Design an enzyme around this catalytic site. Structure first.
Site, mmCIF file in Angstrom:
data_model
loop_
_atom_site.group_PDB
_atom_site.id
_atom_site.type_symbol
_atom_site.label_atom_id
_atom_site.label_comp_id
_atom_site.label_asym_id
_atom_site.label_seq_id
_atom_site.Cartn_x
_atom_site.Cartn_y
_atom_site.Cartn_z
ATOM 1 N N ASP A 1 43.301 36.209 40.194
ATOM 2 C CA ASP A 1 43.592 35.352 41.337
ATOM 3 C C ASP A 1 43.896 36.192 42.568
ATOM 4 O O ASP A 1 43.217 36.090 43.593
ATOM 5 C CB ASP A 1 44.768 34.427 41.009
ATOM 6 N N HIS B 1 37.441 29.980 25.697
ATOM 7 C CA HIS B 1 36.387 30.969 25.865
ATOM 8 C C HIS B 1 35.405 30.488 26.932
ATOM 9 O O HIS B 1 35.075 29.296 26.978
ATOM 10 C CB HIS B 1 35.669 31.174 24.530
ATOM 11 N N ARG C 1 45.461 35.550 33.531
ATOM 12 C CA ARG C 1 44.205 36.246 33.283
ATOM 13 C C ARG C 1 44.078 37.488 34.153
ATOM 14 O O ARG C 1 44.592 37.543 35.274
ATOM 15 C CB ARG C 1 43.022 35.319 33.565
ATOM 16 N N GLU D 1 49.457 33.093 43.682
ATOM 17 C CA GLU D 1 48.122 33.673 43.568
ATOM 18 C C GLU D 1 47.752 34.554 44.754
ATOM 19 O O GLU D 1 47.272 35.672 44.562
ATOM 20 C CB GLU D 1 47.068 32.568 43.420
ATOM 21 N N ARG E 1 49.258 22.341 33.747
ATOM 22 C CA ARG E 1 49.017 23.012 35.016
ATOM 23 C C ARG E 1 48.228 22.117 35.958
ATOM 24 O O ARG E 1 47.245 21.490 35.558
ATOM 25 C CB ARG E 1 48.264 24.329 34.825
ATOM 26 N N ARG F 1 36.203 29.935 42.575
ATOM 27 C CA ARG F 1 37.307 30.126 41.644
ATOM 28 C C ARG F 1 37.196 31.460 40.913
ATOM 29 O O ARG F 1 36.140 32.093 40.882
ATOM 30 C CB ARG F 1 37.368 28.973 40.638
#
Lengths: 942, 272, 262
Positions: A575, A166, A613, A538, A428, A745
């Protein structure tokens, strides 16, 4: 105060959305009780102030003045630091309560088939989607497939849900349990046949629970270590999913009986799995060390053993039978080395071997060492299953399969779902951290500089090493801190059991070299059972090149031998959208999936996609059903992985029934798509998508990339700067300081714009694209309308944009500008807001809606009831940012407003969330509070 | 603190015309009761630990919580060290560990007659058990959280004041002629005469002369039948167990005040 | 500190033409040696505790002695420090016992003496404190004996010589060269061998494949080097090459030692 919050909520919603709609009465019930507890603990003037805050904000939603928020800001300014924290605290608790009420209303809502209109649009809302039995019936009755084909498909299906941290708040089990008690009291208070005494006592219990939740202040516990973050992340598995999986799998048995299949789904079916990124993802996060990864693997093994020990103890109590197999009898008396209860003595042995397994993990965690032998514990799932399957076979042999198909069957389904580690850990790391390692190797050996070599010079060399039989990595290799971190991680992977891990994921993957590089590094650091290697494409350029990349990987003999006919690929939404806007990112992804799939089919490999995401598939509350059905044909075929974002984990899994529906829709949608694909796109649809993409990318990059003043605007109009500097968010916000948005990011990009209610990253570029298509040819408006109504891909992509517009507010985004943006850049701001309103207007036109979310009143009602609390925190955040940033801006200081107590270390209290604070006391904790609550209210956007 | 409802047991205590019920059977049921009591409490305390996550407490609770941070692994829940900013959890975790000792001590006394697990490590009275619980109750009320106190904590307090540390109290029962048999054995052994043959008034006059007197009566050398030894042995078991474990001593086939005063004397002369 | 006399042994180390001397036998004999040593030291230290009864001591000894109180009588400082050394010696011994029985010990290395220097620090502290107090005559008695015992026997009593045949090494390296396609080291002349061996020893790149096909004999050679790599250096003496003929026999063992991680 005296009056209820009921009235101010009624004026926000255009009536009941179903005739069992009690949401507004629920909201009023809980928050009226909260405000009374607030008044009794801190005095009427404080409670009156908080309620006034709520009323001003609710009225602004009724019609958007902006004048009223500025005077609300005026009163919140000049509260003493203690009073500001208490106000912000209370509004956050009220928002939490509202979300609990919404869960209860969704959980017990009576299904109403009359709402269905037929067709795929029904699968976009929970109110209209189809359960597992309805989709089974549709497959046999409309698609025309056999029940045997459906049974076989289910047996070969696996949905893998991947849990992630979270961004602003951890959830401990204690609070999840406080949440459930508040929900249970609310449900029972609304029973039809309620006595007055039961009602009085349930009322007193509800008030008691609300006050307990208010006096723990989980809100103000200061952000935890990565190990604690992982432990709190497992709370939902403990509290709902653990017992949820057997409940749902039993409903699958129900459904197949109802289509003529008279046997249960075999208990060895991995129909649903769960994975974790907490402690595994280290991309741009140096706090995630090799030791943290080892720690979370051992913690997972402890928690599993504990859940098994209690299930097995409840099972021992139940299985008091004495009749049993010959084989079970010989083993039962062997272990006697009470005897008339053979299942109990077998299961008691399993329990002790489980205690050993847990203690061994605890010792390895504390000491790095444990004399508790692997013999004494369970080292494999096979060794754990043997006694349980012995009991299953025995009870069936003696004619009591009915008993075996009770909780013993549940336990077997739990073992085949969770294993001995609850979840598997994904690893990752970004691609250039691997290039750094290999370049250190090549120059140390005097071979050259792998960094400088072409992509094909890289491939040629790496394949020479991989086909060769001679090692490469020197033991004396000079390592930097980063290089040591990559090598150390691989060494930890080598030391731990294979079933602890899923895949090794490569961030910023661009070329087949990135994959082969880590294959080499895995071998060269001693991973005897290598992890599958998974590229994450990405950028748009990398998505374009992705089908070529994987085809060249499939063309290599060595790689085909290693992957044994199975490959996994990860795709990013947020991304890719950060690269060239959402609309172009969505279309490039559809095509990349399409092309990768036939590349895969040509070489005979089973391709699995892992949705990161930001995906429409990530909307696990309901829209994921349609989003999965909308995927390109032949892209799933029984195997798929989806990221469960933290911001929605509570909405999907917090409540027993909602957990059931979340698991159900993932398995139903996935099953149906493989046997019932969506319409294939028409040529004019493709052509229009192609032209829209270039216009959207050019518009997105013209503002984000090519506009010199953009970054300065961004860090003024959003709390992005303070998000980073403060104690929230765990990670460095960007890769290198000062390369613009390029090095920023995804999470901070979306977080910062969502806090201001602007949501720029989700929609920018779409208005230009729509306008360009309408203007190019008058017939194009009608073809986009047809696309929205006929093409699932196009519908789910704009349905997301619509939902985020429902969650936006240009007036509030303008208030941030008014307060925090320099005069010379305010015109630039209002031009972005012009783009906002022009995009929304045309989106509505193409969808054929008069106002936002027309056609999903249920979602519209759920969102609008949050805004009173979100907007309050929005005004609080903006004015707190101005005082943080401007040292001698003040308005009138006010005399203290809350009452209680000379006990307390008042100064230490203003600073709980970050005692080492470098900002004036109270401001950092007030800003974090607004951030936590706005995030809690907004949940998933882009 | 109102024990509006209480529960008692005859199982293992009633021996009237039932020689299966021996002194050691009585010892055994008393120890078993203490074990299960401890188990029910450990579970209630654990779920109360989950609920009481508050950080505000009064001064007395804070200094006590600070103390116990100066010394949790063999449990499932709360195996990790407990942070000092969760005061109610620190106190209740100590309560759980003393209850574990309470249970293990009883298990050892049952298996072997002895336990190296100290009585100090354990809860030996309900007052010692109530002190940590009432400390949390009043701290919760001191800080304005009486509503929270009146939740599960109040339930637990009412359970302690209902069930104590033995769940139920044990009633002992035995028939009156078995007591007369004992007393006749020692009146004859001492050469006083035969208590059986004396009238009800002679029995009373003699019993109360012994009851008012200050000199012991029961010889350790006394020739005992198996029935006489069973009555004597039962009283010895009563003498070696905590008083809270028992209820009344009930005399079956009672007929005269002699039957009552005889057991009062035998109670004292067996060292209760 | 003069090692005027030392003792070594071949038992459990010499494997030349003796296949029952396995890597596990070598691991066992060094762990047994460390247990015997600890027992002899525990006995010597205990008799020395009896002896060193005086109360006068250094400043440095005294604050060490009272540091160890925060943990019989306090007024005997040398007994306090030597009791601590006895405690760790018991830990040293039990840890070796555990590693012998199960391959691993929850008894921490910090709980024990891992070096000869760590063991000597408390003893040399007493020696200097006794002399500082004008009691060198006493120090030159039993304590001096024990120091000479530490500097003679160490923590393993004897060091272990390893020995193995010339051609058992050549067998390993020929298996390596054949497997990588280099050629056959067995057929190369002595000069060709030397030039290749120094090629590899001057080089920075590993050589021994993890997937290398091993016979039982080659596995025994590799396994022995791995055991040597896993044990403390002060347990061993030299590696002896039987039937040595030329400089390549030596350099081959130097390569294999490095390539097996010693």
């Amino acid at each position: 105060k005296h009056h209820s919050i009921d009235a101010q909520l009624r004026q926000l919603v255009p009536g009941k959305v179903s005739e069992d709609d009690k949401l507004i009465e629920y909201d009023a019930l809980l928050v009226d009780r909260f405000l009374n507890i607030l008044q009794d603990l801190h005095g009427p003037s404080l409670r009156e102030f908080v309620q006034e805050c709520y009323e001003v904000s609710a009225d602004y939603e009724g019609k958007g003045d902006t004048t009223k928020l500025g005077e609300l800001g005026a009163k919140l300014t000049g509260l003493a630091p203690a009073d500001a924290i208490l106000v912000a605290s209370s509004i956050l608790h009220m928002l939490n309560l509202a979300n609990l009420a919404e869960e209860v209303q969704i959980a017990h809502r009576r299904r109403n088939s009359k709402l269905k209109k037929g067709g795929f649009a029904d699968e976009g809302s929970a109110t209209t989607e189809s359960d597992i039995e309805e989709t089974l019936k549709r497959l046999v009755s409309e698609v025309g497939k056999s029940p045997e084909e459906v049974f076989e498909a289910l047996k070969n299906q696996t949905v893998d849900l991947v849990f992630t941290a979270h961004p602003t708040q951890s959830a401990r089990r204690s609070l999840l349990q406080k949440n459930a008690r508040i929900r249970n009291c609310l449900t029972q208070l609304n029973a039809k046949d309620i006595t007055d005494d039961d009602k009085q006592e349930l009322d007193e219990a509800l008030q008691r629970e609300i006050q307990a939740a208010f006096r723990t202040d989980e809100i103000r516990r200061a952000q935890p270590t990565p190990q604690d973050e992982m432990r709190y992340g497992m709370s939902y598995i403990h509290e709902t999913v653990w017992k949820g999986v057997p409940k749902f799998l039993r409903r699958v048995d129900t459904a197949l009986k109802n289509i003529g299949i008279n046997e249960r789904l075999p208990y060895n079916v991995s129909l649903i799995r769960f994975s974790s990124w907490m402690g595994g993802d280290r991309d741009g996060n140096p706090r995630v060390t090799p030791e943290v990864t080892r720690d979370v693997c051992l913690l997972a093994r402890m928690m599993a053993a504990n859940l098994y020990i209690d299930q097995i103890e409840e099972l021992m109590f139940e299985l008091s039978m004495w009749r049993c197999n010959d084989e079970l009898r010989v083993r039962a008396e062997e272990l006697h080395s009470p005897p008339n209860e053979p299942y109990r003595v077998i299961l008691g042995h399993v329990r002790d071997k489980l205690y050993n397994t847990r203690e061994r993990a605890r010792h390895l965690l504390a000491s790095g060492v444990s004399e508790i032998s692997a013999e004494s514990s369970f080292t494999s799932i096979e060794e754990f299953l043997e006694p349980l399957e012995l009991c299953y076979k025995s009870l069936c042999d003696c004619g009591d399969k009915a008993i075996a198909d009770g909780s013993l069957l549940d336990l077997l389904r739990q073992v085949f779902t969770f294993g001995l580690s609850l979840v598997k850990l994904d690893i990752r790391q970004e691609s250039e951290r691997h290039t750094d390692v290999i370049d250190a190797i090549t120059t140390h050996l005097g071979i050259g500089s792998y960094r400088e070599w072409s992509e094909d010079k890289r491939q040629e060399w790496l394949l020479s090493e991989l086909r060769g039989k001679r090692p490469l990595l020197p033991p004396d290799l000079p390592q930097t801190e980063e290089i040591a971190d990559v090598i150390g991680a691989f060494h930890v992977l080598a030391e731990l059991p294979p079933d602890s891990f899923g895949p090794y994921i490569i961030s910023m993957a661009t070329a087949p070299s990135d994959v082969l590089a880590v294959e080499l590094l895995q071998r060269e650091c001693g991973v005897r059972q290598p992890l599958p290697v998974v590229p994450l494409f990405e950028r748009l350029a990398d998505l374009q090149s992705a089908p070529a990349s994987v085809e060249r990987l499939f063309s290599v003999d060595w790689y085909m031998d290693r992957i044994k006919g199975k490959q996994q690929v990860m795709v990013g939404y947020s991304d890719s959208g950060k690269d060239a806007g959402r609309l172009s990112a969505a279309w490039q992804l559809y095509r990349a999936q399409e092309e990768m799939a036939q590349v895969a089919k040509r070489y005979g490999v089973k391709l699995t996609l892992f949705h990161g995401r930001g995906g429409t598939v990530g909307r696990g509350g309901g829209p994921t059903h349609l989003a999965i059905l909308s995927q390109p044909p032949d892209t799933i075929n029984g195997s798929i992985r989806v990221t469960v974002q933290g911001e929605v984990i509570e909405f999907c899994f917090g409540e027993e029934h909602l957990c059931f529906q979340t698991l159900q829709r993932f398995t139903a949608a996935t099953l149906e798509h493989g046997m019932h694909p969506p319409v294939s796109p028409k040529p004019e649809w493709r052509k229009l998508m192609d032209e829209m993409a270039v216009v959207a990318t050019e518009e997105y990059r013209s503002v984000v990339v090519k506009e010199a003043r953009f970054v300065e605007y961004f860090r003024s109009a959003t709390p992005e700067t303070e998000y980073g500097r403060m104690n929230i968010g765990s990670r460095p916000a960007k890769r290198r300081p000062g390369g613009g948005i390029t090095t920023l990011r995804a999470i901070p990009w979306i977080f910062s714009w969502t806090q201001t209610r602007f949501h720029l990253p989700v929609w920018l570029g779409v208005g230009a694209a729509f306008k360009f298509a309408i203007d190019k040819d008058v017939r194009n408006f009608q073809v986009l309308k047809e696309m929205y109504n006929e093409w699932p891909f196009f519908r789910v992509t704009l349905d997301l944009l619509e939902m985020v517009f429902a969650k936006g507010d240009p007036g509030i985004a303008g208030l941030y500008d008014e307060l925090l943006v320099a005069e010379e850049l305010k015109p630039f701001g209002k031009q972005l807001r012009d783009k906002y309103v022009e995009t929304q207007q045309l989106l509505l036109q193409i969808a054929g809606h008069k106002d936002i979310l027309e056609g999903d009143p249920f979602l519209k009602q759920g969102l609008v009831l949050r805004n009173p609390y979100i907007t309050t925190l929005n005004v609080f955040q903006a004015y707190t940012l101005k005082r943080i940033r401007d040292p001698n801006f003040k308005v009138t200081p006010q005399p203290p407003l809350s009452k209680e107590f000379a006990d307390e270390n008042k100064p230490a209290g203003l600073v709980k969330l970050n005692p080492a604070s470098e900002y004036p006391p109270g401001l950092e904790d007030t800003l974090i509070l607004t951030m936590k609550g706005i995030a809690a209210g907004m949940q998933n956007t882009g | 603190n109102v024990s509006l409802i209480r529960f008692s047991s005859w199982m293992g205590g009633d021996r009237d015309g039932n020689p299966r019920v021996t002194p050691e059977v009585t010892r055994d049921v008393c120890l078993l009761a203490r074990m299960m009591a401890a188990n029910l409490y450990i579970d209630q305390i654990e779920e109360l630990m989950f609920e009481l996550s508050m950080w505000r407490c009064n001064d007395e609770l804070r200094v006590r919580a600070e103390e116990l941070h100066s010394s949790t692994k063999y449990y499932i829940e709360f195996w990790k060290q407990i942070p000092p900013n969760e005061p109610y959890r620190v106190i209740l975790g100590h309560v759980r560990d003393k209850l574990y000792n309470t249970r293990e001590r009883a298990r050892h006394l049952l298996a072997s007659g002895v336990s190296e697990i100290s009585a100090e490590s354990s809860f030996t009275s309900i007052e010692e058990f109530l002190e940590p619980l009432e400390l949390c109750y009043k701290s919760l009320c001191d800080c304005g959280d009486k509503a929270i106190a009146d939740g599960s904590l109040l339930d637990l307090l009412r359970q302690v004041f209902t069930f104590g540390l033995s769940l139920v109290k044990l009633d002992i029962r035995q028939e009156s002629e078995r007591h007369t048999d004992v007393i006749d054995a020692i009146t004859t052994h001492l050469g006083i005469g035969s208590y059986r043959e004396w009238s009800e008034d002679k029995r009373q006059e003699w019993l109360l002369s012994e009851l008012r007197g200050k000199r012991p009566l029961l010889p350790p050398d006394l020739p005992q039948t198996e029935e006489i030894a069973d009555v004597i042995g039962a009283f010895h078991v009563l003498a070696e167990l905590p008083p809270d474990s028992f209820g009344p001593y009930i005399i079956s086939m009672a007929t005269a005040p002699s039957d009552v005063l005889a057991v009062e004397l035998l109670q004292r002369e067996c060292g209760v």
